[PDB]
Specification:
Bound molecules: N-[3-(diethylamino)phenyl]ethanamide, manganese (II) ion
CATH topology of chain A: 2,3-Dihydroxybiphenyl 1,2-Dioxygenase, domain 1
CATH architecture of chain A: Roll
Number of domains of chain A: 1
Protein name (chains A, B): FosA family fosfomycin resistance glutathione transferase
Largest interface: A-B, 66 and 66 residues
Distance between the termini of chain A: 20 Å
Radius of gyration of chain A: 16 Å
Helix content of chain A: 10-25%
Oligomer: homodimer
GO molecular function, one term (chains A, B): metal ion binding
CATH class of chain A: Alpha Beta
Largest sheet of chain A: 4 strands, mixed
Domain VOC (chains A, B): 4-117
Binding site for Mn(2+) (chains A, B): 7, 67, 113
Order of helices and strands of chain A: EHEEEEHEEEHE
Pfam families (chains A, B): Glyoxalase
Chain lengths: 137, 137
């Protein structure tokens, strides 16, 4: 059967600024880069940045809610979020509707998130403060 | 410090067919559902389906190369691809790179992939046959 996420591939309009964002600003590990892409890791995540002439820099009001959240510890969350803010990283959401999260945009407008907590912890929190109509299986 | 992918959220235009696709067709575990979304898991992956009226059913020619690959064993790959084909799931690309890959679309046109092989395997192949302009770190 399916066992998890093998890799996440993001189309990027300019490879070097995107590599710099994920490696320098977000601290991911750069393993290789070539004329049309790069491979990074973030813990167990394999991230591929793929240079795509079709990628548009997209304002958050023009894209749907599809987004990618990265795990961070409770101890590191606030200072990492504040550093992104001080660096001028654009945002896309303020209301914490799914726990402790910081919502920010990559250079092409990919919707990213810092989140503290696992699925199990989110289900437990939702039992006390459930989303409308929530059912648990 | 970021420690991995916390969750992947896909915006969906209709919750029921998306739940059917990820849970029943793709075999993911459904943990909870509410009026505007669902939580599933696939191995370590926490997947959220978020009902979003701004989600367009998007032909693959009209979206960029951003895509989400799920892990599957080599032994299971062909029968899972055949299952998707029997279900009439559209393919958006043929495989031309190392490791088995099946490129398929979700009901809203999210670009998905079944892939066999790790980042370490890809890097080993690339070291032997580097892409144009490839540098390793
Ligand atoms: C994406 C462009 N920006 C400005 C937000 C950028 C890129 C790489 C690194 C840093 N800043 C630090 C401190 O790493 C900032
Ligand atoms: Mn999220
Ligand atoms: Mn891929």
């Amino acid at each position: 059967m399916l066992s998890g996420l093998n890799h996440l591939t993001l189309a990027v309009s300019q490879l070097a600024p995107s590599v710099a964002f994920y490696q320098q600003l977000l601290g991911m590990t750069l393993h290789a880069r070539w004329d049309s892409g790069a491979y990074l890791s973030c813990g167990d995540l394999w991230l591929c940045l793929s240079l795509d002439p079709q990628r548009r820099v997209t304002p958050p009001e023009e894209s749907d809610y599809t987004h990618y959240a990265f795990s961070i510890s409770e101890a590191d969350f606030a200072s990492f979020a504040a550093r992104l803010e001080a660096a001028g990283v654009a945002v896309w959401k303020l209301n914490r509707s799914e726990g402790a999260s910081h919502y920010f945009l990559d250079p092409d407008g990919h919707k990213l998130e810092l989140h503290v907590g696992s699925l199990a912890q989110r289900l437990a929190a939702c039992r006390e403060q459930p989303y409308k109509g929530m059912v648990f299986f």
